[PDB]
Structure 1
């Protein structure tokens, strides 16, 4: 039985800035392969770095001030109102520092997912804003790759039985082994699982949509291909 379907990325992510600034450098090759956590951009941190240290300097100061006044109050050598204020400043500083630290950190735009980055919608030297509508770039995990198959609700059950009645070659719980046949006609060398758990149902058609998962190193398979799963 041949099931028609479309190939889709296994996982997709968007790269976006979360701090305001100028793109200093774009550390990745358009179209290359990147790893989740890998620095993809560098926003000029000259300032954030400066504010962050400017801050810590402050905290170090107010903190000393506080820790000391608390000693004085204990001898009644300073009104508790003086202390309260001292500790007040200390807490604000401590807050400032944390926010500074957070912003500096957001300075190195990292990749959320592991996959294939494409073109960089943002040029070096460009101005980038936190919250900005457009994404700097998009990564896609193309290795294990999906094949969305759509069968009428009935057939999905028919197959589900055969899977349980051993009439279908097991591949795992709720999964039967399957082969792929490109619209080319050719036979994709490798083979993969065909999970039976439903992903979506067009109630207007009643038809269900399940996913097949094929290994795709070499990146032979790409999203959008009209293929055929085989059982």
Structure 2
């Protein structure tokens, strides 16, 4: 048996923060804390009453300023208005375009969306709370845990050994540039599933020449969680 055991820590596959991008009051939270959410799923409703009225109101200002700029374009061509009058009508119209766009944007942000598919934890913000565009604290955190990472730090010579043995053919291929691996948990138990150990360096230490690589394991139940000390098993 050339049956090697590499120590590692689980970490999330992908992390994203949920932040408000307009001021207002939280009307609804909308997800169950500790649950699965999809990329683009709506997690919060910010009270949209006034955002909705501003947008409607900006739309109505546009339609009217638009009609004036167009009528005045016809009219300067017959010298029924001066060039200044037309310029002023055109400027007011263009200001209106800009104001509708900005109101549309604010109003879209009242639906606060998940940046990624994954698991969401606790809401840091309650219903009825006030939020502010640019505030310091995230409202929540989504973590893709299903494919999960392990994170294996070994000396570069170790990485050489393993890297050559894959090409030589001593290690079985999990795919392109990775070896099949298995996982043993903190309590000695065997994780049923089996992953790839990918040979890409993620970081190389300052002092030590030691390299972190990552295994990827399936995690469709939610058995593995970040921060677990484990051992990848290579044969």
TM (norm. structure 1) is: 0.99
Partner of 2:152: 149
Deviation at 1:203, TM superposition (A): 2.1
Deviation at 1:206, TM superposition (A): 1.1
Query: Alignment RMSD, CA only?
Result: 0.6
- How far apart, in 2, do the equivalents of 1:171 and 1:181 lie? 18
The question of 1:114 aligning with 2:109 is answered no
- How far apart, in 1, do the equivalents of 2:140 and 2:230 lie? 28
- How far apart, in 2, do the equivalents of 1:18 and 1:166 lie? 52
Q: 4+ residue stretches of structure 1 with deviation over 2 A?
A: none
Deviation at 1:174, TM superposition (A): 1.1
Helix, strand or coil: the match of 1:222?
Answer: coil
Q: Which runs of 5+ in 2 are unaligned?
A: none
- How far apart, in 1, do the equivalents of 2:60 and 2:160 lie? 67
- How far apart, in 2, do the equivalents of 1:195 and 1:153 lie? 15
Deviation at 1:172, TM superposition (A): 1.4
Out of 120, 126, 130, the residue aligned to residue 129 of structure 2 is: 126
Helix, strand or coil: the match of 2:232?
Answer: strand
- How far apart, in 1, do the equivalents of 2:83 and 2:185 lie? 79
- How far apart, in 1, do the equivalents of 2:158 and 2:52 lie? 61
- How far apart, in 2, do the equivalents of 1:203 and 1:79 lie? 72
Helix, strand or coil: the match of 2:125?
Answer: coil
Deviations 1:28-62 (A, max 9, x none): 11111111100000000001001001100000000
- How far apart, in 2, do the equivalents of 1:141 and 1:173 lie? 23
Q: Map 1:1-231; keep pairs closer than 5 Å.
A: 1-231=4-234
Deviations 1:55-92 (A, max 9, x none): 00000000000011000011111101100001000000
Helix, strand or coil: the match of 1:197?
Answer: strand
- How far apart, in 2, do the equivalents of 1:42 and 1:7 lie? 33
- How far apart, in 1, do the equivalents of 2:136 and 2:167 lie? 48
- How far apart, in 1, do the equivalents of 2:160 and 2:106 lie? 53
TM (norm. structure 2) is: 0.97
Deviations 1:93-129 (A, max 9, x none): 0000000000000010000011111111101001110
- How far apart, in 2, do the equivalents of 1:28 and 1:197 lie? 36
Deviation at 1:173, TM superposition (A): 1.6
- How far apart, in 1, do the equivalents of 2:159 and 2:231 lie? 16
- How far apart, in 1, do the equivalents of 2:157 and 2:36 lie? 41
- How far apart, in 1, do the equivalents of 2:186 and 2:127 lie? 40
Deviation at 1:171, TM superposition (A): 1.2
Helix, strand or coil: the match of 1:48?
Answer: helix
- How far apart, in 2, do the equivalents of 1:26 and 1:148 lie? 34
